[PDB]
Amino acid sequence: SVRKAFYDFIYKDDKSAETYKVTTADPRTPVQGFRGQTAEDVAAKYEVTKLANGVTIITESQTFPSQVDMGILLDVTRDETNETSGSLLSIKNTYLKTVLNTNETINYGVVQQSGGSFEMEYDQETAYFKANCLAHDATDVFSMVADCALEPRSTVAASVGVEKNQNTHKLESYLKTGELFNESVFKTAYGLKGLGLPLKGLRGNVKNLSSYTLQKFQLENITPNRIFVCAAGVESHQEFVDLVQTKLAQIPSAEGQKTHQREKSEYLGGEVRNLTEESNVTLALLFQSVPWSSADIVAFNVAAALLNNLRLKKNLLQKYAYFDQAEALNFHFTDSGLFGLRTSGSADRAKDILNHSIAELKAIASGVNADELLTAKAALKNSVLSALERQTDRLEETVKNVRTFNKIQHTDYVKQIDSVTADQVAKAVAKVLTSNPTFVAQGSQVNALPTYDAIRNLLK
Amino acid sequence: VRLEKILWEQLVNVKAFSRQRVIGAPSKWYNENRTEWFKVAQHNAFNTGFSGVILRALEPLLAKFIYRWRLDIAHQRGLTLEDSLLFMDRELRRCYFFETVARQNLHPYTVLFMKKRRARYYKVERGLRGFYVPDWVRKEAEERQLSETVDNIFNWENFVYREYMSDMTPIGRWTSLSKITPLDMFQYYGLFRNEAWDRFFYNEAFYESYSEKEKQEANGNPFGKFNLQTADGRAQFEKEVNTFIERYPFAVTKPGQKFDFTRFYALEDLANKRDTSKYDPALLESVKNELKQSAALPADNGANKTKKSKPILPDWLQPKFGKAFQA
Amino acid sequence: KSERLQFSKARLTDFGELPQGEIPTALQYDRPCRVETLANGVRLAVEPSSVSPLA
Amino acid sequence: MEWNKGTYMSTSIKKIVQYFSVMTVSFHDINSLFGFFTFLTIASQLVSGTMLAFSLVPEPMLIPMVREEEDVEDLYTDDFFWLHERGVDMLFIFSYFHLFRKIYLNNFEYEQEAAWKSGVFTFLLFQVVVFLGLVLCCTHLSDITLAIAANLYDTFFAGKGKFYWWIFTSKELNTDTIIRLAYLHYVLAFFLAYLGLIHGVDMHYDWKNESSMDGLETEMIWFDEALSNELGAMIEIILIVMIVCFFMYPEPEALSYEFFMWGDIGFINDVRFLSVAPHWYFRPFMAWLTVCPFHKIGLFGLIYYFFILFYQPVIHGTNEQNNYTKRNVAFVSFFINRSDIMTPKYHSVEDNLLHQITFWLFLCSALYVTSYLPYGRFYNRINGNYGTLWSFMYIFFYLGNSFLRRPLITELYLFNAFVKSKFLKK
Amino acid sequence: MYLPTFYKLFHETNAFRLKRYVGYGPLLLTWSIWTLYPALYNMIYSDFIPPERGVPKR
Amino acid sequence: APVFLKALRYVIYSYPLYVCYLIKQAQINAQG
Ligand SMILES: CCCCCCCCCCCCCCCCCC(=O)OC[C@H](COP(=O)([O-])OCC(O)COP(=O)([O-])OC[C@@H](COC(=O)CCCCCCCCCCCCCCCCC)OC(=O)CCCCCCCCCCCCCCCCC)OC(=O)CCCCCCCCCCCCCCCCC
Ligand SMILES: CCCCCCCCCCCCCCCCCC(=O)OC[C@H](COP(=O)([O-])OCC(O)COP(=O)([O-])OC[C@@H](COC(=O)CCCCCCCCCCCCCCCCC)OC(=O)CCCCCCCCCCCCCCCCC)OC(=O)CCCCCCCCCCCCCCCCC
Ligand SMILES: CCCCCCCCCCCCCCCCCC(=O)OC[C@H](COP(=O)([O-])OCC[N+](C)(C)C)OC(=O)CCCCCCCCCCCCCCCCC
Ligand SMILES: CCCCCCCCCCCCCCCCCC(=O)OC[C@H](COP(=O)([O-])OCC[N+](C)(C)C)OC(=O)CCCCCCCCCCCCCCCCC
Ligand SMILES: CCCCCCCCCCCCCCCCCC(=O)OC[C@H](COP(=O)([O-])OCC[N+](C)(C)C)OC(=O)CCCCCCCCCCCCCCCCC
Ligand SMILES: CCCCCCCCCCCCCCCCCC(=O)OC[C@H](COP(=O)([O-])OCC[N+](C)(C)C)OC(=O)CCCCCCCCCCCCCCCCC
Ligand SMILES: COC1=C(OC)C(=O)C(C/C=C(/C)CC/C=C(/C)CC/C=C(\C)CC/C=C(\C)CC/C=C(\C)CC/C=C(/C)CC/C=C(/C)CCC=C(C)C)=C(C)C1=O
Ligand SMILES: COC1=C(OC)C(=O)C(C/C=C(\C)CC/C=C(\C)CC/C=C(/C)CC/C=C(\C)CC/C=C(/C)CC/C=C(\C)CC/C=C(\C)CCC=C(C)C)=C(C)C1=O
Ligand code: HEM
Ligand code: HEM
Incomplete structure (x- = not known):
């Protein structure tokens, strides 16, 4: 009105304005003429439906x-070949770049002005896009997410991704991040093929990540049977089903057509010893543990929790001053797994670090005490339930459980954790120890370390 | 102040006049392909209405003074219309957008041949003026028909739109030049643009566009509404195609030969659902092979490769031959 | 429920955004919370969430 | 000033010397050398005007006598005055030929912006200096020019509060006005040299003797290979001008336009208003004023001509949207059933015939406008020359309207042919 | 969601900046009125409010 | 498409014609 325009032209308060009264009320008292209804939580109901x-x-x-969360999961780094290695990294670095329906600028502005968040991540066997926003913005955000996930990569996106991948590789090498070491660990474990393919992609192939290679990778990997769509905070399943129908129903069915498929993984217990003139030596010792389908995954998670929370700190870091940092790594895949230790300490006396790490790993195989098991289970429950409490993480793990097993198993993790017993964990770790060790060493004096046969004998 | 909710917008953009702003799903700026827009506009202007009637009568003059003129000049220069239409000399010489797109997407030869073709003529014309390209070069210039130049033009324009022009968001801007001249200093870009005021948001629905009926109609028969099934339609279609071929010498056939209508009818029948065995099996096989080859993107054989260089330091930069027991 | 569709855009009556006073429907609801004071002056507040897995 | 990003070239002596000693020029013809002729005429104008300044006393009542007496007692003074006048004439000729040549090549593209505008500004300044120079003659022609300029200046202020006094004191040529205008003339004439240097540096970014993109990569070294050709072309054009002037202007002539310069301010009070005529280069503007008897509309026409001449790259350029700009069309919307139209792309120079026809119509209209004086004594009582009105209106339409430049007809016809050929050959 | 076109943002920002700069127009006008006041008086009492047409008897 | 831009285009096209009309009227008046 005239009064508002006048009081805005001269920067003076309008006392009689109702908005001013609402925005300058006493924080210790409720607002004068507004009050929100009270509501109580309701149980969670999961529903899964396949499209035609x-x-x-x-x-x-x-x-x-609360805010509506949405996500698209793809079974599509394990599925990359040497020609197209690092395509997932380029997509991640340019996950907002789409051209068919909406522009990079517009799809960034949608996230910015919706107040929500949009993110992408990718593992060896998974690629997950997730966007959380308000209900009224749900349709636009879902359209953006679907376009980003399923639209073929463009030439401009390919160029930007190549540049960003070069920057990422330079940063990773400069910081000497633990991921750069895990890449060598995986290469040793499985070789240059399959799981061993680096998540960041081969550095020599970065220049080859053109739109053609990315589109070929997507065509040979992204198929309607390998796509999952998830929502959380949805009042009615049918509404979201219709929303997904309006977008993903076009994709013609790939059933009855030649699929790329995944070749079965093979485990090899090689060794790597890098001289780098580093004041500190980092070692890793991993073994083929178990896949997702097995019943010992909970046992290995409990073992990792026991190592990290209780044993590694007390027996390795606290007692010895030359242990910079020790942590247990545990990865599980659809057909393979890797459980082990990664310990970084002083370059000199690396033999002592190696021997102590082997002894600590073998301690679990020797046995586990009741109090230690209870403490590890309590810590694992705390971590898992903290993850599950947040809606986004709960939805993500729901999608992963559904894509791994048709049922949802994250609603009863507590029961499985309780079912674990010390004998089961000890037997699982002892059986895993017999496998071919995967031993990786970097540092100044990696050369003066026991041979592979010596390490096997120590583990034996 | 907000441009929307301004007094003019409040009084005019109201449901009463159907001038209200409508908010829909977000969409990219530059939503309409220029090539498709020009196709539809050309069809509407030429093959419909009083404008179409007038422009049809002007086909002789336009063909003489706008097509055969350019073709004659290009042939004099040993060039074709492609050299002047696929990539304009402006883009070829100095254009940063074209340079970047070509570097990021195009193989070097695609523009190197374009530049060298003009270099052929202008190494002589500048040395001595009035150069008329000899017959042997003119022959290779004349070999390529316009039917392939149009394919290249449409491919390039569609690629540029789908990859770059479809990923651009223009903004309000001041003078690009950092010139102290006051006239250049206070140049204002963003107002006086129809697109700037047509939609104030990226969510607004588009209010002006071609109807689906017009888009489908523009993809019919350019020469006119005929019925190739009936003999009466085929006669008129052949007459129109013959006069077109006469007007445009190097458009679809050499200027001394005649167009093969049976092959065209076979292509139309194969492309659409209509089918029959009224054509010889040899004709059908040839047409299918030609269609496959025309749509086949060339690929590299990886054969007949030259030798790669692995240079080494000369002898004088290397230690002498002798090498005795050090101690 | 405001209407059948949760993802409706009807309330967005200001060029794709809510007007100045309005708020999203999701924020119109508040979880129960009881605050009490003891003799010692210690103030106890509880905002239960039954569906949550942790306390 | 964060908005100003920087300068294309730093005009330092070291860098200027290096740039001009390493400059390369592609092979060219005489048509693409009018800029060098303009610059050389500017240099000679600077020299000759400096020589003249030491003779001209800025008092109005002494300038005629001083000029007459110093031509005899001093050698080469009248030679320098003649050189100055003919240099002004040739400078106008070369500048307008350069403008026509650059309009012909469709240099309104974005990459030409810095090249184009920097030039036009120079041209604009080159106008002002000329005006000031006229005032220094202290003849009736100078009186009329000063009066017209003062009235135009006072037009903006609605004839209120003598805002013109700081330059056009009393709107008459006196000691103060002559001194101020002479000093401003000298300073702006020397500033023109720097403006021309800046324009020459800017324009080399994308320089082309012809629109067609020759594939040649080798280029001439400027210092002597190109400079010698530039000097020789200047010599040839000067020979042609000498021949044309010798034959077109007999030694004694009847009814010349210089006859209005007989009257000297102060000596002669009465002015023969029957025969009022400026030099041919300012003839078109006086003709426009006579043709358009309305003062405000005439001033607006002059300002519009100059400023639209300045803003050619913006109206007719790509505009950085890569030809995806949408025009406003009066009647073509009904024919195409579209409110707007995408800018046409194929607007070559040598090939297309519409561009040449329109450009030569514009050039001939300009020549006809400069061809004669409308003779306003009864130019309106007698129905005026329709050719003059047609030429002026075509000049206004050609500069500013994009339907006479980058026409849509060529693009539509080419697309129609493309569609027909592709349909026939699939 | 609110996704205004950057054209509109630039136009609004420039409108506000023009509003800010117009405030100093009266300032410079007052400075130039205090200065050159005799010129303002001559302008106001020469064209506006023209002098009366009359001459003294002497 | 905007009304004011279309009006500006119409004014640009039609103003020279209005000037010509004014000039013709001025000539007719000068005839007397
Ligand atoms: C010949 C005899 C007389 C000589 C007089 C010399 C000057 C005397 C006063 C100043 C003395 C100190 C000089 C210090 C210079 C420091 C900068 C420097 O050297 O940088 C290199 C500079 C270029 O800088 P740049 O960063 O490259 O920017 C240009 C780019 O190329 C970008 O190009 P673009 O295309 O984008 O722009 C085109 C063009 C477009 O330009 C325009 O359209 C604007 C019009 C031109 C500028 C007008 C200035 C008006 C000044 C009035 C002064 C009144 C008298 C009182 C003076 C005392 C102080 C009040 O731009 C320009 O030309 C801008 C450059 C301006 C050059 C003049 C700089 C000095 C004056 C600055 C103000 C006073 C500073 C005083 C400092 C000391 C304290 C007293 O080159 C020159 O200085 C060129 C010199 C040419 C000399 C020839 C004669 C011209 C004299 C000046 C213009 C007079 C016009 C008529 C005025 C009439 C008034 C009624
Ligand atoms: C109180 C008293 C105060 C003192 C008063 C006295 C003042 C004395 C000043 C002395 C200046 C020394 C300048 C040194 C360089 C001169 C050139 C050179 O290297 O000579 C070797 C050269 C060796 O012969 P050559 O093997 O055939 O080579 C010929 C080429 O010139 C060979 O050239 P090129 O092809 O190898 O390459 C030329 C150029 C590549 O081309 C270019 O890039 C040309 C330059 C581009 C930028 C400038 C454009 C405009 C051109 C220059 C201006 C020309 C007009 C000057 C008008 C002045 C006013 C009237 O490359 C360069 O050389 C780059 C540097 C160019 C010179 C600038 C830098 C050094 C000198 C200045 C340094 C300080 C900064 C300046 C401000 C200082 C203020 C204190 O000597 C001659 O040929 C000299 C011939 C002289 C006789 C013919 C002309 C006579 C005049 C006839 C008219 C009637 C008057 C008769 C005479 C009356 C008595 C005087
Ligand atoms: C310090 C370093 C050097 C610096 C160099 C600076 C260079 C500057 C370059 C710019 C110079 C600007 C002035 C250029 C002047 C150009 C000439 C000019 O204006 O005209 C001069 C004059 C005319 O000047 P005017 O003053 O009389 O002009 C009349 C006035 N106006 C034009 C305003 C109407 O022309 C001549 O008369 C010259 C030619 C004389 C005759 C010779 C040619 C005859 C051709 C026919 C011959 C046929 C014979 C056939 C039969 C033979 C039988 C044997
Ligand atoms: C195209 C040309 C390019 C090259 C040239 C570049 C020019 C660049 C622009 C320069 C503009 C300079 C304007 C100076 C005006 C001075 C005279 C004047 O103000 O009016 C005199 C006149 C003086 O009148 P007067 O009546 O006293 O005149 C004396 C008359 N006799 C001798 C008979 C007594 O002013 C008026 O009459 C108007 C009064 C206005 C009062 C209100 C103020 C208005 C705003 C004034 C702004 C002044 C700014 C000065 C500084 C400018 C710095 C850039
Ligand atoms: C708002 C509007 C403001 C004005 C802006 C308008 C645009 C202005 C653009 C100006 C461009 C100027 C370019 C000038 C380039 C040329 C310079 C030049 O040559 O010097 C000027 C010259 C020299 O002028 P001059 O004044 O020295 O001498 C000419 C003398 N009068 C004027 C009496 C003719 O000007 C001209 O006269 C040029 C045109 C002459 C055309 C004559 C051709 C022959 C005609 C024959 C008639 C038919 C006979 C046979 C009939 C029977 C057979 C068909
Ligand atoms: C001395 C008197 C001079 C009067 C001059 C009048 C000139 C009239 C013709 C030109 C007007 C300006 C054209 C550009 C307008 C901005 C761009 C545009 O098209 O906007 C359309 C836009 C939107 O147009 P729209 O509504 O068609 O767009 C929406 C279309 N749908 C709904 C289909 C998506 O409208 C506006 O908001 C602009 C309103 C007009 C603003 C004009 C301001 C400048 C002119 C007035 C200056 C002040 C004069 C004071 C006189 C005082 C006299 C005492
Ligand atoms: C496309 O590529 C191209 C270019 O790339 C940019 C070009 O540069 C160009 C040309 C552009 C240029 C800027 C260069 C122009 C070309 C040439 C040959 C130069 C022309 C000028 C001259 C020959 C004269 C040179 C003069 C000077 C360097 C001095 C400048 C003036 C100074 C220092 C002050 C003058 C002072 C005065 C008082 C004036 C009077 C002077 C006198 C000597 C006379 C009186 C003397 C006294 C002492 C009283 C072309 C054509 C081109 O094709
Ligand atoms: C709005 O109002 C305004 C104006 O008017 C409208 C203006 O004009 C202006 C600008 C104008 C001005 C301020 C006036 C300026 C005027 C100018 C530049 C005109 C002059 C231009 C020229 C090129 C003059 C050139 C002159 C010459 C070549 C003369 C050469 C003479 C000599 C002596 C040279 C030799 C000597 C030297 C170099 C001195 C060195 C020392 C010696 C020789 C020592 C000798 C002694 C001993 C003992 C040895 C402004 C700012 C303005 O506001
Ligand atoms: C491009 C540069 C210049 C141009 C375009 C120019 C233009 C002119 C013109 C058109 C005239 C009137 C000629 C006539 O009416 O016939 C003139 C006269 C004059 N100019 Fe310039 N001028 C320039 C440079 C200079 C310079 C640098 C000076 C002084 C340093 C100067 C000093 C004079 C003088 C003194 C007169 C009058 C001479 C007399 O009346 O006898 N001029 N100028
Ligand atoms: C006194 C005035 C002028 C001078 C001293 C001058 C100087 C020059 C010179 C020396 C050149 C290089 C030689 C050539 O291209 O022929 C040039 C080129 C150029 N001039 Fe000017 N010029 C002037 C006026 C103008 C005008 C009026 C315009 C346009 C309205 C203009 C626009 C250009 C352009 C665009 C080029 C580059 C042409 C190209 O890229 O092919 N100049 N100028």
């Missing part, structure tokens, strides 16, 4: 009205 083409949609009803 093969796309499967998971949904969870709203426990308490």
